[PDB]
Amino acid sequence: SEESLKHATRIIDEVVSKFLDDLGNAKSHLMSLYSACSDQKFQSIVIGCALEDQKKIKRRLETLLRNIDNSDKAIK
Amino acid sequence: GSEESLKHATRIIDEVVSKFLDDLGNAKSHLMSLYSACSVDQKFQSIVIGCALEDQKKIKRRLETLLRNIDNSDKAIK
């Protein structure tokens, strides 16, 4: 029993840690795109956009980062 | 050009978000799989069977809590 507990916990801990890793990549991927405004192929696409649309893009990235921060926060 | 650049830049963000939602979906299906092994995955179900009955409930409960939390991670993405 004592050993089984730690085993089941390990199996669950892996699924969660993996999810948190994926949550971490999307977050850094989102940050790299953001700094590409405020990563390399995105930056080059951003300049071809009109300033108004560059404002929207940045804003969207900001909002997304807040959203994914709440996603991380959801995992207690 | 500008509205075309919009579309290009917009779908690159969409793909990053989309890959995250798929990753979230995979965590959810994997937790659901382990949970219905309590409520199938033999390897996990066997490990739990060996758990003290009380410990079993704790495990099942963590799974329920994680599946609830993950649903909140999901809804957080607008």
Curated annotation (Swiss-Prot), chain B:
Domain BAG: 5-78
Subunit structure: Binds to the ATPase domain of HSP/HSC70 chaperones. May interact with NWD1. Interacts with HSPA1A (via NBD), HSPA1B (via NBD) and HSPA8. May interact with DNJC9; the interaction seems to be histone-dependent.
Function: Co-chaperone for HSP70 and HSC70 chaperone proteins. Acts as a nucleotide-exchange factor (NEF) promoting the release of ADP from the HSP70 and HSC70 proteins thereby triggering client/substrate protein release.
Protein name, as recorded: BAG family molecular chaperone regulator 2
Organism: Mus musculus (Mouse)
Lineage: Eukaryota, Metazoa, Chordata, Craniata, Vertebrata
Residues included from the entire protein: 107 to 189 of 210
